[PDB]
Each structure stands twice: as C-alpha cells, then as structure tokens.
Amino acid sequence: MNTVPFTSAPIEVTIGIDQYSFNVKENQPFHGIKDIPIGHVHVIHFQHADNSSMRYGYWFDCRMGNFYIQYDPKDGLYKMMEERDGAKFENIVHNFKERQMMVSYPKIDEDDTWYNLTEFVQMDKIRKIVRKDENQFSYVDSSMTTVQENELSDPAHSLNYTVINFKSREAIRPGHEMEDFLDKSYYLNTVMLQGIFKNSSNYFGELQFAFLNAMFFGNYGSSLQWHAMIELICSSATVPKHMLDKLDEILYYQIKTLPEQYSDILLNERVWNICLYSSFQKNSLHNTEKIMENKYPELL
C-alpha cells in the first residue's frame, strides 16, 4: 500500500481520492493519503473552497514513482511532484505516519467499485491522451478541451481522445453510405478496434477514462467522448459477444457510482434512450438497463 504525502494544506480545499472525498480546512495539519491500493491507477483531485471554479487533479500510478502534493502560492494550486530521492521520501512518509497526519484510503474489503471503474485504464494510455511527457502523472481539469472540440484552442493542454464522428469519411465507406451510417459495425470493428485501438481493452480503457474525467471534473468534452464510444458500440449490429457483456458491466458500475444529483448534466438523454431502447444492442445491456430504469427513470 502506497502513499501520497502533502507538504501542507495552506488553502481550504475539498480533496478527492478516487471515488472518495474529504474537506481540509485552511492550514489544517494534513499531510496526505496513505494505504492507497497498489495495482490500479488513481486520481487525486481538488476543488478550492473559495473558488469552486476549476476542479483539477492528477492521474497517477504509485508503481511508477514516488509522488507528493505541494501547494504553489504563485500558480494557486496543489501540484503533484515526483520525489526522485527514494530514502528522503520514505523518511518523510514515515514521520507523517508516526504523527498520524494522513488519512487512510478507506477501501471496504467487499468493495470492487474502483477496480470496476478502472478495469481497463492504464497509465500508459492516459499519458497519450494527456500529453505532458516530462511527468509520470497526468493533470486534468474542468476546462480542458478535446482535440475534436478544438477542431470545431491551445494544443498542449488538450485531451487527445480518439476522434469519433459518425458523419465523416472515416466512418463511411464510399459506396456503403446507407449501410455504414445505419449499422456502424465497419467503423467499430475495422476502423476503430482493428485499426486504431488494436483491441477492445484499449477501447474500454479510453471509455472508462472519459467517464471518470466527466464525473470527477465536470469535463464536458470527456462526457461527449464517453457517450460517443457507447453509441458507436450500441449502433453496431455486429459486436463480439464478450464486448457486449463487458460493456454492460462497465456501464453498470458507472451509472451506480454517478452522484444522483449530477445525472441531469452528465447523462445525454438521446444517447441513452437510443442505446437502451432503439439500438441494435437494445437487448444486450440487461444490468445497465435495470439500474438506469430503477435509478434514473425520468431521463427515460
């Protein structure tokens, strides 16, 4: 179990760690988060008490280095940094743990929620969507736009999700216009899966990463990407049976975890009604349809 120490907490802030969150008061004696489960990516995220504008945070994997947080009073935010000196880091953490200045990642043993939300998310793929190669961890915030959003403005700060556009030459074979527009299997299986993602695991990892950025930061282009990747599968008549079954599980845990009071903004009525009730795969998402119906029947 690994640790993300904090130098200090100089400004009052709500701190998120994965699906958990806690409030730290201004100059409260807080020095980080311990007992973070190894084997998954994680996200630590921030919303300042004084300015709820800009949720921001860092995707990281503790196996890839020793990371800590330190507030920067010039740029006004909590920054993740890597500590290259292994013994210094261990010594700092042990002191903070002895003085019990760290909260404990509060993972219930029965609870597979985080695993289920990040099953296919890899740091190496995150770092290609979020391009900042000098760091081993990836910064995301509320306001970052996607490559697709920028086409329709700073490239260094973009989310490089895979562009999906149903009315594009990539999506539509010359001479198969009606076929390919009404049944997106070509675009899903040949262009996207075989061509770009190489396999369903990479496709699902991006889908899960887009959802998590939508949920934790309110990142609108991430929400668009999540819905587009769902819709591309649901709108394909020919989808491997294992992908459909896994998709149902993936979405189930995403809908289960969504705050009840954010559903209005995070969920696209048209996509969901189409996917559950009108699409080729209308009958292939049993778990997701049951939780959606029992938890968000108004959207439908």
Binding site: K167, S168, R169, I172, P174, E177, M178, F181
Partner: protein, 237 residues
C-alpha cells in the same frame, strides 16, 4: 441554416443552388390480396431537383425495378435520392455544381450529407417553407414521362418554359409555386383553369400553356381564387 421567409431572395442570387424534393420517389398503390390482406404495388417515381434561378429541372425517373427485393423502402428511398443527387453533382462540371442544396423534407438531411461527404463546401440545408413540389406529377408531360419509363432515366426540363425571357426568376418561382399549390389543392379545377380555352396551346417543348402577360395575370388570379375557395370548402369559412 434553414431556408425560410426571412431569406427568400437568396434563392435568386447568383450562387448556384438546387432544391431537392423526394416526395415522389417511392410511390405505391395499396390494395387487397386474394386472402384479404393488404399489399402495396410500387409505381414509377421521380426525384425533383430544381434550380430556382434558371428553371432547370433534373427529373431523375425512379423505375420500380430499383425496389425489387429491397426492404424498408421508405428509408431506402431517401438514401437512393441522396445517391442520385450526389451522382448528378459529380456529373456536372465544377462551375455548374451547386454551392447549396436545399431539401424540402428534413429526413433527407442526413442521407444527403452522408452521400456528399466528398463535397464539404456544398451546404445541405432544410427549409421551413411548405413547397408544393409534390404536385410535379400533376404536370401532364412530367407524369407521362415517369409512367412510361421502362428503365432508370434522367429527363431534363425547364420548368419555367420561356418565362424568364419576360419576367424575373423571383416572379417565375412565385408563378410556379402558385400553379403547383393550386394543382395540389384541387388538381381538376387547376387543370380546368389552364386548359379551358381551346385557343391557348402548349408548345411541344413546353410544360405550360403559352399565355400572354395579361392572360397570365388572369390565370394567376384564377389560381389564387381556387386556393382560397378550397380553403373555404375545407375549413367551412
């Protein structure tokens, strides 16, 4: 965006454009089968593609053989229309290709957009106008060429005959839409108005009768009266 009353004069400017109407592409008669079920029999159809500035009508005849063995015909008809419009555009020299294509029904937007991906600079637009182009099959010579076709065929007409020699496009389009609206509201009465006088004939190479200017005014008045009459008969006013 959408074409409506506010931007009506745009139709007659010097940017090439085409209206596309698909309402007569897929045509059926519904009948009873021997077993007392209902069945359709398709008849020949047509795409109505019109340049409102010039009067040029590209009448692509849709022969019943195109539906043989096909399912979901009313959906296919929109894609076939889009396919044929795209093929027409590609067949035209670059300087004759439209800069805009206006579809009379919004369900044609996605089929045409998809078929025209190769032409990203051609705008595909809907309209809020209720244009009466469905009544094209009430024009006798157009109806005749469609019904007689034994194979797919493109037939070219000027739907304004020679009117542009004497009147502007704006007025010619107004006349056309009034005539077609009347043929759509009461075809029998409209045709009675247009042919009642044995001395006025239709030139072999024309669609409509050879009316003088004064006679067109009389005709146009009679057509308005017809539309208002039908509106009274319909709504009891």
């Amino acid at each position: 965006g959408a074409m409506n009353s506010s931007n009506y004069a745009e139709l007659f400017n010097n940017d090439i454009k085409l209206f596309v109407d698909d309402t007569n592409v897929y045509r059926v008669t519904v009948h009873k089968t021997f077993e007392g079920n209902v069945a359709t029999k398709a008849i020949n159809g047509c795409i109505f593609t019109l340049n409102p500035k010039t009067g040029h009508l590209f009448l692509k005849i849709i022969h019943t053989s195109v539906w043989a063995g096909q399912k979901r015909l009313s959906q296919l008809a929109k894609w076939k229309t889009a396919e044929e419009v795209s093929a027409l555009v590609r067949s035209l020299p670059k300087e004759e290709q439209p800069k805009q294509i206006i579809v009379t029904r919004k369900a044609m937007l996605d089929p045409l957009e998809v078929h025209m991906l190769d032409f990203p600079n051609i705008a595909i637009r809907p309209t809020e106008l209720r244009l009466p182009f469905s009544a094209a099959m009430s024009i006798d010579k157009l109806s005749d060429v469609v019904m007689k076709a034994t194979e797919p065929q493109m037939v070219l007409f000027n739907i304004y005959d020679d009117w542009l020699d004497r009147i502007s496009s704006y007025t010619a389009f107004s006349r056309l839409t009034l005539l077609l609206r009347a043929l759509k509201t009461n075809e029998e009465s409209a045709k009675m108005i247009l042919l009642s006088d044995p001395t006025i004939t239709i030139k072999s190479y024309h669609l409509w009768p050879s009316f003088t200017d004064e006679q067109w005014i009389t005709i146009e008045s009679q057509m308005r009266d017809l539309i208002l009459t039908e509106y009274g008969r319909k709504y009891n006013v």
